């Protein structure tokens, strides 16, 4: 189950993605980002990215339709 | 004579039915009737879907042509599929699963022309990557509602162990129709027919990759060894117990080195079995 | 050029855009000889 | 039949659009800028005959 979960992770991170930028972070899992759309969104981080990579100008991809960024 | 929670089967042939139709009209709404079985007042099996024809009007009982469903019923007949339309479908490409007023229109006058059918709406861009967005609603009739009762006898725990997205509320579900819960009917003879698209075929089993590029990728991955065991003795070196803050070494190294070794494994026993077997 | 569903890649195209620039060039001046202009032989030679 | 499911086929929002360059097709290709300031390839040009247009 665990192997299956993650799979499903690795598919939620697919190819469709929409690229932003990453602002200042919020919490461990959430953190605020601007789209290349030009909105600003308040966005839940998926917990397999390095934090350390996060920068308040790091080019950052997020989900196409729920703006989730992975 | 209220129905409850309830049940509504689709089978498979028509759940890929249902998303080939969506996908090919993207980004046009495209509708068309479900052929099925109402059995008993607990379930509703739609057992196989037809499209027909995008028109203009776009989708509405003015899109419904009587005479293309009357003489696709007439050959369906022939051919083994006697079922009546149980319901209908269309497509809501770019937003979730939700009747709008023209939808409430349609489902009215299939209401009409019935008592118990269904709607079905299917997302065809967001129903992707393995997650499916379908779901099946049927009108609420104002009269019960302007009388303060609650949609359906609760009877089970079956029903609510569903729970509402809540993007279809603020369109009106539990308001002017509710969502009945969905269910597939495959059979294990249909799902093992299925399984032949991702099934391995027995050379394809025994292919043993390419040792060029799985070297290449050895090395790559001992390069993130390397990079992970300086970032271990990093971790180590913190040891003096402070406040408790698995990132940065421990579990990437920890699963980098587990896919090493089972790809390792799997490539040598591989080539060991081609080199027994073939001569 | 992108599917508008899946956004993948389906074929490059020749490169960039702009019909201003196709008017700009497809413009018509007519049939002018250097003979039909007169007293500027010097400038002209100079041109080319 | 056809031209009954063309003409119904023909809504009438036409969103109009610029004609930009007519690239040759190759394995009939017109690429617009919309009035709503996106631009489009058309695989197939349409209903219209291909050099009557001009970007
Ligand atoms: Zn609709």
Redesign the interface.
């Known amino acids: 189950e665990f192997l299956h979960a993650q799979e499903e992770v690795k598919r939620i991170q697919s190819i469709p993605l929409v690229i932003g930028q990453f602002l200042e972070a919020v919490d461990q899992n959430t953190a605020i980002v601007g789209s290349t759309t030009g909105s600003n969104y308040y966005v839940r981080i998926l917990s397999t990215i390095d934090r350390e990579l996060l920068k308040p100008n790091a080019s950052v991809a997020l989900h196409k339709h729920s703006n989730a960024l992975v | 004579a209220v129905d409850t929670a309830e049940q509504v089967y689709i089978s498979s042939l028509a759940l890929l039915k249902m998303l080939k139709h969506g996908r090919a009209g993207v980004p046009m709404e495209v509708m068309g009737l479900m052929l099925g079985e109402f059995v008993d007042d607990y379930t509703v099996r739609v057992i196989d879907v037809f499209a027909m024809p995008q028109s203009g009007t776009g989708v509405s009982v003015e899109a419904v042509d009587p005479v293309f469903q009357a003489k696709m019923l007439d050959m369906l007949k022939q051919t083994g599929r006697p079922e009546m339309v149980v319901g209908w479908y269309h497509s809501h490409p770019g937003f979730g699963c939700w009747l709008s007023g023209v939808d409430i229109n349609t489902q009215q006058s299939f209401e009409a022309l019935s008592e118990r059918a269904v709607a079905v709406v299917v997302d065809p861009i967001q129903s992707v990557k393995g997650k499916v967005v379908i779901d099946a609603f049927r009108l609420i009739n104002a009269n019960m509602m302007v009388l303060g009762h609650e949609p359906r006898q609760t009877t089970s725990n079956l029903g609510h162990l569903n729970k509402p997205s809540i993007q279809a509320l603020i369109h009106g579900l539990n308001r002017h129709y509710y969502s009945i819960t969905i269910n597939y009917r495959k059979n294990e003879l249909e799902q093992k027919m299925l399984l032949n698209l991702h099934k391995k075929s027995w050379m394809e089993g025994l292919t043993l990759q390419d040792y060029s590029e799985h070297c290449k990728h050895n090395e790559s991955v001992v390069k993130e060894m390397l990079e992970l065991a300086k970032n271990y003795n990093k971790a180590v070196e913190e040891e003096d117990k402070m406040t408790p803050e698995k990132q940065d070494p421990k579990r990437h190294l920890e699963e980098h080195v587990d896919v090493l070794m089972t790809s390792n494994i799997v490539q040598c026993l591989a080539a060991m079995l081609d080199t027994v077997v073939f001569k | ?1 992108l599917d ?5 890649i389906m ?1 490059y ?2 490169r960039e ?3 201003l620039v ?2 700009m060039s497809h413009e018509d001046p007519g049939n002018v000889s250097y003979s039909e202009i007169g007293g500027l032989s010097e400038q002209i030679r100079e041109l080319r | 039949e056809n031209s009954e499911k063309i003409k119904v086929n023909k809504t009438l929002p036409y969103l109009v659009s610029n004609v930009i360059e007519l690239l040759d097709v190759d394995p009939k290709c017109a690429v617009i800028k919309t009035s709503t300031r996106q631009t489009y390839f058309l695989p197939v040009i349409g209903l219209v005959d291909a050099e009557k247009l001009k970007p």
């Open positions: 050029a508008m569903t899946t956004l993948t074929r195209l020749p855009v702009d019909p196709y008017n």
